[PDB]
Amino acid sequence: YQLTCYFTNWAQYRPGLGRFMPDDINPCLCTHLIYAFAGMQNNEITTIEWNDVTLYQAFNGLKNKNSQLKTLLAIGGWNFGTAPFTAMVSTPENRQTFITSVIKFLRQYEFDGLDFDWEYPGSRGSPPQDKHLFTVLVQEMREAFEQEAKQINKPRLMVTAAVAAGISNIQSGYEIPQLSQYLDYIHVMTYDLHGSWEGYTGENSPLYKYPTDTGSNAYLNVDYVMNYWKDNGAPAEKLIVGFPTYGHNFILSNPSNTGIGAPTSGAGPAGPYAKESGIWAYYEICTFLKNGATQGWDAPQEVPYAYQGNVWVGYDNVKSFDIKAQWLKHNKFGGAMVWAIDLDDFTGTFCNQGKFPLISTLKKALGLQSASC
Numbered sequence: 001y002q003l004t005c006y007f008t009n010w011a012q013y014r015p016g017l018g019r020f021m022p023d024d025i026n027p028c029l030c031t032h033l034i035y036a037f038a039g040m041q042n043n044e045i046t047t048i049e050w051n052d053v054t055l056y057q058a059f060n061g062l063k064n065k066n067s068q069l070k071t072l073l074a075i076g077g078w079n080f081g082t083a084p085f086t087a088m089v090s091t092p093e094n095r096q097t098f099i100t101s102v103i104k105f106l107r108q109y110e111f112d113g114l115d116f117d118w119e120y121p122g123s124r125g126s127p128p129q130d131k132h133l134f135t136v137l138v139q140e141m142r143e144a145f146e147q148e149a150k151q152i153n154k155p156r157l158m159v160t161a162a163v164a165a166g167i168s169n170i171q172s173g174y175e176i177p178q179l180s181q182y183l184d185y186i187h188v189m190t191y192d193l194h195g196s197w198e199g200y201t202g203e204n205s206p207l208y209k210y211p212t213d214t215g216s217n218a219y220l221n222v223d224y225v226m227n228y229w230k231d232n233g234a235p236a237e238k239l240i241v242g243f244p245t246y247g248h249n250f251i252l253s254n255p256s257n258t259g260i261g262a263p264t265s266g267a268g269p270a271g272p273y274a275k276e277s278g279i280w281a282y283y284e285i286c287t288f289l290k291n292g293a294t295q296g297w298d299a300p301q302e303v304p305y306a307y308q309g310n311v312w313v314g315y316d317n318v319k320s321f322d323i324k325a326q327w328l329k330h331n332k333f334g335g336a337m338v339w340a341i342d343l344d345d346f347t348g349t350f351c352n353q354g355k356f357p358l359i360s361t362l363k364k365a366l367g368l369q370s371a372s373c
């Protein structure tokens with residue numbers, strides 16, 4: 001199995017114990033590390049933070065401590081939106097401009113490949129033609145990488161992509177069989193499956209359906225989503241299951257109603273480190289737990305939840321990560337990816353379960369513990 005871990009270049013700005021830099025990464029923890037994010041200017045890949053070049057050096061420098069480690073640069077992400085991708089794929093000139101810049105950029109800064117985080121072709125403003133044009137872009141990139149490898153006589157750069165978990169988004173976004181052919185790995189974003197937008201409590205990344213989930217709600221679980229990708233053309237071995245080291249929180253409409261599907265009246269409070277409306281990093285959740293929040297277990301879906309006063313959080317812990325890792329093995333998927341390494345309890349001080357307790361759980365469960373360094 002692979003264990004692919006996203007690092008975020010804005011984690012550096014979190015106060016005190018929240019600050020996470022590339023040198024905070026244990027080089028022996030994951031098999032692949034992904035740097036989020038690069039941007040785009042005039043159809044060319046660019047840095048986004050002032051210190052990205054220095055951070056690229058530290059990040060890829062981790063490969064000096066673990067010879068097996070591969071690194072990829074992620075372009076795009078949620079806030080990036082679709083507009084620069086749409087314009088870039090709109091013409092073969094723009095795609096070649098982009099592809100050329102990517103080869104040069106990855107080789108210069110010592111990345112082993114590119115992760116596409118276009119969220120998403122065919123939605124969030126992206127027109128219907130982008131579904132096919134994404135396939136075309138990925139084909140042309142994979143073919144350019146193959147070409148370059150011949151020119152410079154080295155193994156080719158990798159191409160991977162983060163892909164939607166929502167069924168409508170998948171249908172409007174991807175030519176699964178054709179696309180799957182050209183990608184090295186498919187990082188399926190099996191999280192944010194529920195949230196306060198829905199008006200009821202729900203889990204972030206439930207493994208299975210809750211009994212009351214019917215109709216389109218029956219699709220909002222890891223198992224359904226991973227099998228949808230496989231059934232519609234992605235080889236199990238290229239499929240990588242998304243694991244979140246965070247949870248969504250909610251304001252309960254009634255503090256006495258705390259089960260799955262209890263009414264909610266909005267997004268729960270930002271945490272004191274990540275400062276994210278309606279979302280707590282795992283280490284932030286550990287504070288909540290440590291200070292007396294009531295813990296629940298959602299047995300049907302194999303995930304924890306917790307509540308206190310009017311606040312309810314659906315999340316993942318060591319138990320739920322282990323359960324999902326065993327499931328992944330039973331289904332023989334390619335491995336796991338983690339959003340994000342900087343949201344795990346990297347200091348060990350919040351949850352008191354050792355450093356990187358969630359990601360270490362996956363490393364152990366996936367038989368990677370004896371991996372080389």
Ligand SMILES: Nc1nnc(N2CCN(CCOc3ccc(Br)cc3)CC2)[nH]1
Nearest residue numbers: 078117162189246274276279280281339
């Ligand atoms: N592979 C990949 N590419 N893009 C993603 N996702 C990550 C999650 N994201 C919504 C929640 O994002 C936050 C935000 C803040 C905090 Br704290 C925790 C999570 C959407 C984009 N995954």
